[PDB]
Symmetry: C2
Subunit: 179 residues, 2 copies
């Protein structure tokens, strides 16, 4: 139940249901303390980072995405494994999902260190729109590809989000099992 | 750089290079204060904490265990891939570690496991896990198949694959739960 008030603000996007503002390290102390508390609050589930925030019309902070510079990520790949049975049993074509993290470091630009959305405003495209803004705004004048972003230490929510967001059952990660 | 003092502790094994003791939720207030300070630096109720203390009196390893019902299998594979080098293509295999979505029953969750950096590769983590197997459920000796590891790090992955013997191991608080 945390709120946030302008003192300027810097809007990257406006919508029927709210706004996405960005906050940078150079911003007033008032902004830096709020990202902090929001950080702390999100942790229940610094240097050249950028923080995105989705603010409901209410002024309530309902989205947060913290992003950092990186050089490398590791691909996670959706596989669906065949279940083979004994020759005396009947055959079924149900596959079992598995998620495979490649050990090969592939090139990357933008590491999503944190990405959170308030439990009861989920599946409303908030996280998608935040990344969409991260992409247009991580580098001034560039539109990052889906592959230049990696997600730090995916939770299962993150996995299911990332996969659908990027298409093709793949996404890059870091702070994970291969590095 | 924490030191534990010999008191009358619950000692699970003695070794030439030190000992392993255990701290339970309802222990004396000293014990639980010490475990908490070991918790913090490591990270730079229904649980059990195992400490490896060297003859030097130093806290050299920490193992925090936990009850659980479910784990997910992680296994190394070589995935068919295409290597593309400006127009030119070849077929190859990429090493990857695969986590199955299938829940499997597990009893004991290694929520933390840690050995002080200078003391690694001296079988301290292996031993902590041995003390754990024969001190988790009374009158019972845990199978490797009944142990799972919380959110493994790359170090923990390299340890578990070898410690578990099969090239496979179970996890939780990971990408599938
Ligand atoms: C921190 C990291 O780097 S990764 C971990 C991310 N942080 C967390 O896990 C904290 C708790 N969870 C969350 O905050 C949220 O679940 C997030 C950030 C992962 C997703 O937030 P949302 O705003 O609900 O995602 P969004 O609406 O943009 O998702 C769009 C699509 O992604 C997929 N998706 C997102 N979350 C889920 C889910 N929990 N289960 C299944 N599919 C999902 C769906 O296809 C969804 O489309 P649909 O609703 O039309 O069927
Ligand atoms: C929180 C969790 O649940 S998982 C995360 C585990 N903890 C951490 O990541 C903290 C940092 N790392 C660690 O503290 C340690 O490396 C631990 C706890 C993973 C292992 O501690 P150790 O006492 O060095 O393990 P141990 O000595 O019993 O290793 C036995 C075998 O596992 C394998 N192994 C253990 N560490 C490694 C490694 N870093 N690289 C490659 N193989 C390894 C080796 O085969 C080793 O046998 P060997 O030395 O004869 O070749």
């Amino acid at each position: 139940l945390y709120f946030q008030s302008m003192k300027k603000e810097r809007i990257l996007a406006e919508y029927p249901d709210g706004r996405i503002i960005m906050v940078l390290p150079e911003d007033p102390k008032y902004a830096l303390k709020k990202v902090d508390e929001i950080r702390e609050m999100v942790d229940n589930d610094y240097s050249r980072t950028k923080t995105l925030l989705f603010i409901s019309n209410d002024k309530k902070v309902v989205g947060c995405l913290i992003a950092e510079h990186i050089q490398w990520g590791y691909r996670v790949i959706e596989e669906k494994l065949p279940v083979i049975r004994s020759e005396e049993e009947k055959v079924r074509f149900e596959r079992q999902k598995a998620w495979c993290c490649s050990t090969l470091p592939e090139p990357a630009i933008c590491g999503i260190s944190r990405i959170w959305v308030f439990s009861m405003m989920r599946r409303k495209k908030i996280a998608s729109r935040m990344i969409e803004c991260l992409r247009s705004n991580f580098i001034y004048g560039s539109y990052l590809s889906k592959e230049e972003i990696a997600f730090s230490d995916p939770t299962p929510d993150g996995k299911l989000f990332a996969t659908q967001y990027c298409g093709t059952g793949q996404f890059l990660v870091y702070n994970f099992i291969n590095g």
